[PDB]
């Protein structure tokens, strides 16, 4: 509806060419009924040419992703810290579009690959489009934009055979990580549950770089952007993520689409850490360094407003595929910093859209257009959609009365560089020595996780590094891990049959910071949209009655309920053939269905039991409803007294207990820990 | 209208980026006042990226041209001969756009090169866009589309050095013409005054190919399209065209622009010759052969309606440069024929727009859009400007209720191939023997010109062939010319110092046809827009008074008057420095200015007399107004008794006589003839 | 030819497709002798598709031009002023390609329009391609690259009707000149005989900007490039130029082509004015200001070597139309200055080749290739002609033994920024007041012409 002016309705009418001539498109024109096709068949050629040219280049990174429309609402008048118009009044609303993504995979790769995730937000402001092009991880692998192709070549598939897809689990990636120690912090985040989020809705977004807020008086402060999820944080477990990559490559885009259509559109508090210019080097690291966080203990979050996604696209290609974000899409009241990663990005995003669009007029695509007037002397180029009336498109002119007028700090609400910014020194291709500590913050992050989270991170590294063929690369990796934590290096080395190097305690410490643990972020604040699989049977009418009564009680609380049975019928959503534990956040067996848990042509041997066992092993709340639990729980080897295992006769009591389980989300006592 | 919706007004406001952010664009952002430019200067890069990408590939042919908007009005309900909707009612109006062009020159080449000229007309009909992509000459050089690159490579500049621009006067072109005798008919037209028309408004347009008109009952007739100029026919002389190419490379586009702005928008009667399907081979040649005309004596013209151009474009690049014509843009009621030149064109024009536009969505540019709804399953591609609501874009479907519906002869006013068409025989790459007479019609054309026109054509061939370096090519040329006319070959040979081959009378005859002669087409039906230069002086108050009284009386009759003098002042439009005889259709000297016709720092020596003499030598009406007369005519060696030479004291009597001269347009008795 | 390995010979043999299948190309395949053309006629479609796509975008400026190959020969070992390898020995020869042009006209406009002219030279050095992208007039219209589209829009045809072609003789151009007084110096040069040279061979070339020569020890000097014509200087007269624009739009390209074929290949002494860094503001104007010349009386020319053009192209499109010059094509021993016109050009020329070539691999076109090995981790892109053996194209790596190695001042003959260059002050979009005298040098130029 924000792009309603560009919509084309095909719910009625006769087929036409692109120039409005009514045609057919089902049979080629031929010289006789069993004859050759004619070149004069323009109906054929226009249709096939279009098809032949449908594809455009995938994004060079973040190729796999999905988007939605929404609204940003300001919680206050923020004039006292920024001139930005979209933040200048309590309750002020601005349309947004957001795209979420992975980084490394090509555009049909699985959502649930282990990776960094993008979170890109466009504010269609009344003073121009403003984009925050962020990730779900607050720090980046590298300290200089010029290194980006080195990073990306190393993590993408090996270029002789293009193996492996959407994965860091190969020699080249771990070679790069071990030789470029800046990578350690982002690596630790990606090897945590932050690399396999439960959904786009259950992850945060970060600007990563320090930016500036600039007031109308010219004064500036340093900021970091934080989008805090109102759905809570949650992750998958790796073994789950692997199966889900096969059973549902579209899991995250489906989850987002469904949440929006059910009226559960996801929300984030859009926040900033704000510090003075004088604190650039006050926190024991450089705020120009994008491998570093500011701990919340040193600078608290200020909540600026609400981001809500509540409308799905009409056409994916036209909206999601074509949206072209840029950190260069900046508005008055915001400015850059001398972060050498940010500085280079400003070049890349303007240039890459030429590749994607094939032409320079990509800002004229509906999804990229602003919602205010455009007044400039840009002309021509392939795909030019405007018809410009001003026939004197040069400045300075008298023949168009000196219009358009120049905008700056003092006239026309122009963008302006923060006027206190300076530069001083030699022109150098040198790294600031203030960037040289690559290991303390990785250690801060590791220290801040729970014991089971630390085990999962260790396990993710053991998984990936065990697939590295080069013994030299594996040694080099242990050398770098060892500088973060001797314990990590020892535990990782045990899996790959190497000795860890001797402890090097230069960067070891015991500091912790709040807000980076997933397990530690307590029960989820809402269980709406979570998925409950009810395993039933058509062989017992009482099993379907149990299923229907459970459905009513669970749906009342906004859970998405799937009843599973051997075959479809009224009340049954899915067959055992298509069902999997990866499709549910909790699994309930109705006790009328106990007999399935001891063969059928309608689903693979042991499928009903496998769903239950997989769900248990992956830490999910599981239960049996009806009061006869022993047969199912014994077949599964699930103890009745287990945490997150439910056994009740009463449907009401069953659901009350089970819903607490869904909020807990994962029962971490079911995972073994290294001594 | 898609044009009005995309018009952009920059007559007020502050400069913005393409995403609506107010900016400046006059100074680069630098590290200090004498420092280097910063990469983070997004204002710089967006502006320069746009400039860097302004150009698109020129058209492969017809790159040099100009366009205007107007209206077509039907004179009648033509249902009795065609189903075409734009012809289905008396007074029915359809918007048009027309582009006129040369063929061989690049953008930037001179309008007044000797060449075939394009005349491409788009009708934005209520049943889709219909294009007639025609030339100002009714026959084409070649008989099969597959030869087009051979023709075009031969006429375009030699590919080692890219010489010469916009000219057939070089060895490769005449090699091709002499080896491919199909070229003779079009060659004769191009070597006549049809190769150097006075304006786009003073030339006719032709579809060239035989097409079909198809009725709603399925019956068909064969047609040729003829656009007959209501301004009359007129040419330049070669020596004038050469000078004009240097003095004003924009002469034809200026003439069109100016006529439209003064409310003298040019008009054509849109006509057809209509013959029965059974007459395809009845006239002594094949109607599938595009090297042949139907003589008016064999099939008279039917006037279908009025084409008027009356509005200039707003932005040349957006409208004229981007307009993308196709013979494949056809409507119900029209069909193709098996002309092997037409057949191949249908492929070329769909394909080449991919080159020009850089992507498949070229029909979405405003100038290319239709004026009725588009309903089809074409999707995606670079530059996709629509948001399609139908999410089941396939046929057959139930999930969008079977829409869009198929259109055909019986439903939806679908296009349909003429149902009487058949094909029979071997699949062959062979030329029909009915196409083999390459010489009789060239001779018919030559016979139909006046003696002086025949001399001009011989003179154009003497000029071009004299510049061919190869003696063998020159001999081969005489061989082919000789098959058309022994006299032509004798007269051409005299200039290049070869002997003509012996007469070969196989194709010789004395038949003539009406309507192909320019000299023969009688006085112009209107003199509005024609240019009168009045040569005066600032020395003499009486010269300027003579000039002003002449101006008033000439401007009354719609003539564009320029008073020329040594310097500008009130009443004087142009200096002798910038004035040339090529800028006028008639030249008047006022008596008071006699002294200039016997040196000055304000213009080149002899410029005033040169303008007068050049005008006389090129056949234009010339005179002296004031009744001294003898001194100026003696200085010029212009005889007072000469046809188109005027000498009067009375301004009223002078103008009455002079205006008849302008209608006569050219005085051909001033050109020498071969014995 | 220097480009002999890429040449295709068609002086014998049978017509083939682009994939070597022998074919014909004179008649379409039809359903009967008077029948419609068949879609299965691949001979037709491959031929016509190629034709349909022959054209590329003309250059945004300098679209009308012509080129030739030649040789540059150094007169000495210039190590005392520059590390540049092509200048490091007496008699050292380097292949060149040069393109000359007008500025404003489209690619079939007249050579003898009144205009500034381009003079672009590529040296295919043994340390990489070095381009000097110069003009025949030593000063430019504007003082900041960001103004270039304003200048060019004003001088190009009015955008409602695209009139007039290749001429400053219209309201918009003179509006710009009169409102932007920086333009006065170049305007006076264009309005002199330098706007209508007799030939490309009878004009000089200038780098325009101050550049730096950098020695292997890191010290730098400021230079201006001057290519002095050994044929002399000569102009047309305007009335002559106008007539010639119609009688022979190809006059300058024909003149060059003919001179080369007759064994009269044109020559230039390649010269520099060399001054110390301390003289940037010593001559009464700023050397960062591209609207200013250094009078020969203040800094004399040093002759570095001979440029001779002596071989015409084989294929105009492939060589002349496709050559893609960049001031960013720099070699060790040369460096930029903070001239805000030069600074912006560095961005433009890399970007615009994407428009012309339609793809990122434009340096692989034969005319653009270097004459020395390429070792880098650039990969893929449309039109990729190389087959790279190194399957670890990232730095730092161990799996390709740390190759390619980094090159810099101290290893691998790397390019390096002149190490004494600094910046200091506010980040500003402000013009230096040292650039404000727009009128004295125009007057110096006018004073220096003869009465006629
Ligand atoms: C020097 C190059 C470079 C560097 C250092 C980065 N990126 Fe980037 N990024 C690109 C070059 C790039 C790109 C090649 O320009 C992409 C590809 C597609 C596009 O429009 O831009 C891109 C895409 C891209 C997307 C996808 C936007 C969308 O959904 O369409 C996200 C979310 C980011 N990037 C985020 C980041 C973050 C958070 C970074 C570091 C803090 C980062 N990028 C550094
Ligand atoms: C098989 C190729 C071929 C053949 C045989 C022809 N043409 Fe064509 N023509 C082209 C291939 C083409 C082209 C390459 O497709 C052009 C260049 C730009 C475009 O839109 O199509 C074109 C452009 C073009 C234009 C310019 C349209 C404009 O103003 O934009 C006109 C007026 C014609 N042609 C007319 C003719 C006529 C009357 C022909 C024979 C009767 C003819 N052409 C044969
Ligand atoms: C910021 C933009 C800009 C600015 C300030 C300039 N130019 Fe430029 N120039 C271009 C943008 C450009 C371009 C758009 O990037 C072109 C078009 C084609 C190409 O390869 O580069 C170009 C082409 C071009 C050519 C044609 C090279 C060839 O023959 O292919 C010459 C000789 C010059 N320029 C010379 C200059 C000189 C002597 C300048 C000032 C001292 C100058 N340009 C400033
Ligand atoms: Ca690998
Ligand atoms: Ca976790
Ligand atoms: Ca392209
Ligand atoms: Ca030739
Ligand atoms: Ca049909
Ligand atoms: Ca103008
Ligand atoms: Ca002179």
mmCIF file with all atom_site columns, C-alpha atoms in Angstrom, chain C residues 30 52 56 68 71 75 86 115 155 167 195 237 250 291 296 303 306 330 338 381 387 391 401 435 440:
data_model
loop_
_atom_site.group_PDB
_atom_site.id
_atom_site.type_symbol
_atom_site.label_atom_id
_atom_site.label_alt_id
_atom_site.label_comp_id
_atom_site.label_asym_id
_atom_site.label_entity_id
_atom_site.label_seq_id
_atom_site.pdbx_PDB_ins_code
_atom_site.Cartn_x
_atom_site.Cartn_y
_atom_site.Cartn_z
_atom_site.occupancy
_atom_site.B_iso_or_equiv
_atom_site.pdbx_formal_charge
_atom_site.auth_seq_id
_atom_site.auth_comp_id
_atom_site.auth_asym_id
_atom_site.auth_atom_id
_atom_site.pdbx_PDB_model_num
ATOM 1  C CA . UNK C 1 30  ? 12.020 -19.956 -45.547 1.00 0.00 ? 30  UNK C CA 1
ATOM 2  C CA . UNK C 1 52  ? 21.961 -5.275  -33.351 1.00 0.00 ? 52  UNK C CA 1
ATOM 3  C CA . UNK C 1 56  ? 28.486 0.909   -27.174 1.00 0.00 ? 56  UNK C CA 1
ATOM 4  C CA . UNK C 1 68  ? 47.483 5.798   -33.296 1.00 0.00 ? 68  UNK C CA 1
ATOM 5  C CA . UNK C 1 71  ? 57.016 4.668   -29.386 1.00 0.00 ? 71  UNK C CA 1
ATOM 6  C CA . UNK C 1 75  ? 66.667 11.045  -23.773 1.00 0.00 ? 75  UNK C CA 1
ATOM 7  C CA . UNK C 1 86  ? 60.132 4.173   -18.423 1.00 0.00 ? 86  UNK C CA 1
ATOM 8  C CA . UNK C 1 115 ? 36.651 23.398  -28.942 1.00 0.00 ? 115 UNK C CA 1
ATOM 9  C CA . UNK C 1 155 ? 28.293 23.564  -23.366 1.00 0.00 ? 155 UNK C CA 1
ATOM 10 C CA . UNK C 1 167 ? 29.437 24.386  -30.196 1.00 0.00 ? 167 UNK C CA 1
ATOM 11 C CA . UNK C 1 195 ? 40.283 26.200  -30.518 1.00 0.00 ? 195 UNK C CA 1
ATOM 12 C CA . UNK C 1 237 ? 40.710 30.515  -39.653 1.00 0.00 ? 237 UNK C CA 1
ATOM 13 C CA . UNK C 1 250 ? 37.017 13.729  -40.799 1.00 0.00 ? 250 UNK C CA 1
ATOM 14 C CA . UNK C 1 291 ? 43.180 27.540  -14.218 1.00 0.00 ? 291 UNK C CA 1
ATOM 15 C CA . UNK C 1 296 ? 58.125 29.627  -19.109 1.00 0.00 ? 296 UNK C CA 1
ATOM 16 C CA . UNK C 1 303 ? 63.069 17.646  -22.412 1.00 0.00 ? 303 UNK C CA 1
ATOM 17 C CA . UNK C 1 306 ? 60.586 11.725  -27.845 1.00 0.00 ? 306 UNK C CA 1
ATOM 18 C CA . UNK C 1 330 ? 49.914 5.649   -12.414 1.00 0.00 ? 330 UNK C CA 1
ATOM 19 C CA . UNK C 1 338 ? 45.617 18.068  -4.016  1.00 0.00 ? 338 UNK C CA 1
ATOM 20 C CA . UNK C 1 381 ? 32.698 -10.467 -13.218 1.00 0.00 ? 381 UNK C CA 1
ATOM 21 C CA . UNK C 1 387 ? 41.437 -18.731 -15.991 1.00 0.00 ? 387 UNK C CA 1
ATOM 22 C CA . UNK C 1 391 ? 42.475 -21.106 -5.707  1.00 0.00 ? 391 UNK C CA 1
ATOM 23 C CA . UNK C 1 401 ? 52.372 -19.511 0.486   1.00 0.00 ? 401 UNK C CA 1
ATOM 24 C CA . UNK C 1 435 ? 42.104 30.325  -6.174  1.00 0.00 ? 435 UNK C CA 1
ATOM 25 C CA . UNK C 1 440 ? 44.921 38.273  -14.515 1.00 0.00 ? 440 UNK C CA 1
#
